[PDB]
């Protein structure tokens, strides 16, 4: 029972159904193995281990997987890409992510931090050892993290360096907030998201208080993004194959901390997309017929702190996103691959 930090090629596992035509099920059918039937972790009594969620190769390996999955499934009619115009089919596919597990080969094990207040960086006291991670839904989105896990007690603030304003902050919520997005049946690209306002604003209240704990009680100010290409300025996600862009100004600007009802965010289903996998534009086909609906859980927030506010008494935070590696980070944060012996 000796180990050291190391990186190896992992393998993936999932409860995919071989009959299902959903693209995540197909990709996991040919690319992952069945999940462990009898998994079990080994408690490491009075062992303290150092983790770093911002420098973890697991994240890059999952990222490479999700790039491959999307490359094979969600494929665009036209892909303007650094001067090329690769054209191809874009059949309306079935899209709904399933949990994926990340497993070590023989000779390696993953270490899992069970400290219920772990912030992703430095020491962990209650350390367990596993062979596979839990099932992680690979939900691509900006500004808001959806379908995710929740912090087990206090709202957790994750960052590689909180005093460096350039490094993204991940708010890990301890209570989810439902966001219910609909494109009603047949402007066929107009859509909207509904969110409970009292819930959302109570949770933003709590986030404010946490950030106060992290910033010497400086005043905390929320604002929408300041410049961006649309995938950043708007909450962008995929609903049954369609790319939704949603204005979140009503979430990051009324402050509202007589306002307490149901927030309705306007949204558009875009066709031309700035891809998150790599630089380039992808053009898909117009939306499917019928009502397109997704009821997701908001479980985390991607935030960028404003710079140059050192000599002021405020700290400004704006929703961020773009690098999906942080999206996988928000779930992989408690894991670490150690080579055995």
Ligand X SMILES: CN1CCN(C(=O)N2C[C@H](CO)C[C@H](C(=O)Nc3ccc(Cl)c(F)c3)C2)CC1
Ligand Y SMILES: *[C@@H]1O[C@H](CO)[C@@H](O)[C@H](O)[C@H]1NC(C)=O
Binding site for ligand X (CB under 6 A): 140-142, 229, 231, 236-238, 243, 273-276, 278-279, 321-323
Rounded to an integer, what distance in angstroms lies between the CA atom of residue 55 and that of residue 229?
A: 27
- Please state whether 46 falls in left (phi above 0), alpha (psi between -120 and 50) or beta: left
Which of ligand X, ligand Y, none interacts with 210 (beta carbon under 5 to 8 A by kind)?
Answer: ligand Y
Task: Write out the binding residues for ligand Y, residues 23-52 only, by CB under 6 A.
Answer: 43
Stretch that binds ligand Y, among 11-19, 47-55, 58-66, 196-204 (CB under 6 A): 196-204
In terms of Cα–Cα distance, which of 317, 12, 267 is closest to 162? Answer: 317
Residue 337: CB minimum distance to ligand X, A: 23
Q: Are 100 and 66 in contact (CB under 8 A)?
A: no
Cβ closest to ligand Y, residue 233 vs residue 327: 233
Q: How far apart are CA 69 and CA 91, in angstroms?
A: 16
Smallest distance from ligand Y to CB 254, Å: 6
Nearer residue to ligand Y within complex by CB, 107 or 122: 122
Quote the DSSP letter at residue 133.
Answer: P
Q: Which does 174 bind (CB under 5 to 8 A by kind): ligand X, ligand Y, none?
A: ligand Y
The reply to whether 216 sits near ligand Y by the rule CB under 6 A is yes
Phi-psi region of 239 (alpha: psi -120 to 50; beta: other; left: phi over 0): beta
Out of ligand Y, ligand X, none, what residue 135 binds, judged by CB under 5 to 8 A for its kind, is none
Say whether residue 15 binds ligand Y (CB under 6 A): no
- Pick one of ligand X, ligand Y, none as the site partner of residue 253 (Cβ within 5 to 8 A by kind): ligand Y
What's the closest the beta carbon of residue 187 comes to ligand X, in angstroms?
20
x/- string (CB under 6 A) for ligand Y, residues 255-284?
-------x----------------------
d(Cα 272, Cα 79) in Å, to the nearest integer? 9
Which of ligand X, ligand Y, none lies near 274, with the C-beta cut-off 5 to 8 A by kind? Answer: ligand X
Q: How far is the CB of 225 from ligand Y (least distance, A)?
A: 7
The burial of 160, by beta-carbon neighbours within 10 Å (0-12 exposed, 13-18 middle, 19 or more buried), is given as middle
For helices 325-332 and 57-72, what crossing angle results, to 10°?
Answer: 130
| Whole-number Å distance between alpha carbons of 292 and 289 | 8
Tokens of 190: 């107009």
Instruction: Count CA atoms within 13 Å of residue 318 on its CB side.
Output: 14
Q: Are 108 and 132 in contact (CB under 8 A)?
A: no
Binds ligand Y (CB under 6 A): choice among 73, 75, 249, 339:
249
Alpha carbon distance 288, 232 (integer Å)? 25
Crossing angle of helices 57-72 and 23-31, in 10° steps, is 120
Asked if 145 contacts 327 with a C-beta cutoff of 8 angstroms, the reply is: yes
Contact characters 153-192, ligand Y, x per CB under 6 A:
-xx-x-x-xxxx---------xxx---x-x----------
Spacing of C-alpha 106 from chain mean position:
29
Piece of 73-81, 86-94, 120-128, 279-287 that binds ligand Y (CB under 6 A): 120-128
* Residues forming the site for ligand Y (CB under 6 A): 43, 96-97, 114, 119, 121-123, 126, 128, 139, 146-147, 154-155, 157, 159, 161-164, 174-176, 180, 182, 194, 196, 198-199, 202, 206, 209-210, 216-217, 224, 233-234, 237, 247, 249, 253, 262, 294-297, 308, 310
């Amino acid at each position: 029972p000796v180990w050291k930090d190391a990186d190896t090629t992992l393998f993936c596992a999932s409860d995919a159904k071989a009959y299902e035509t959903e693209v995540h099920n197909v990709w996991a059918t040919h690319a992952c193995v069945p999940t462990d039937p009898n998994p079990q972790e080994i408690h490491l009594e009075n062992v303290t281990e150092n983790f770093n969620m911002w420098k973890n190769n697991m994240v890059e390996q999952m990222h490479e997987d999700i790039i491959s999955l999307w490359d094979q499934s969600l494929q665009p009619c036209v892909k303007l890409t650094g001067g090329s115009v690769i054209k191809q089919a874009c059949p309306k596919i079935s899209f709904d992510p399933i949990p994926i597990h990340y497993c070590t080969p023989a000779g390696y094990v993953i270490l899992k931090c069970n400290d219920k207040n772990f912030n992703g960086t430095g020491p962990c006291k209650n350390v367990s050892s596993v062979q596979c991670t839990h099932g992680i839904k690979p939900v691509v989105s900006t500004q808001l993290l959806l379908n995710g896990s929740l912090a087990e007690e206090e709202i957790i603030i994750r960052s590689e360096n909180l005093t460096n304003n350039a490094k993204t902050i991940i708010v890990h919520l301890n209570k989810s907030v439902e966001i219910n997005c609909t494109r009603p049946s047949n402007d066929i690209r107009k859509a909207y998201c509904e969110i409970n306002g009292t819930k959302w604003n109570k949770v933003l209240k709590q986030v404010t208080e946490k950030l106060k704990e992290h910033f010497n009680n400086k005043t905390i100010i929320f604002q929408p993004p300041s410049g961006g290409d649309l995938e950043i300025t708007m909450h962008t996600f995929n609903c049954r194959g369609e790319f939704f862009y949603c204005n979140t100004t009503q979430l990051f600007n009324n402050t509202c901390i007589g306002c307490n009802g149901t927030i309705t965010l306007p949204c558009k289903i875009k066709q031309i997309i700035n891809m998150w996998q790599g630089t380039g534009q992808a053009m898909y086909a117009p939306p499917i017929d019928g009502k397109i609906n997704c009821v997701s859980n908001i479980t985390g927030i991607l935030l960028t702190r404003d710079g140059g506010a050192n000599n002021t008494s405020n700290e400004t935070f704006r929703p961020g996103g773009g690098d999906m590696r942080d999206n996988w980070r928000s779930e992989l944060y408690k894991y670490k691959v150690v080579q055995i012996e």
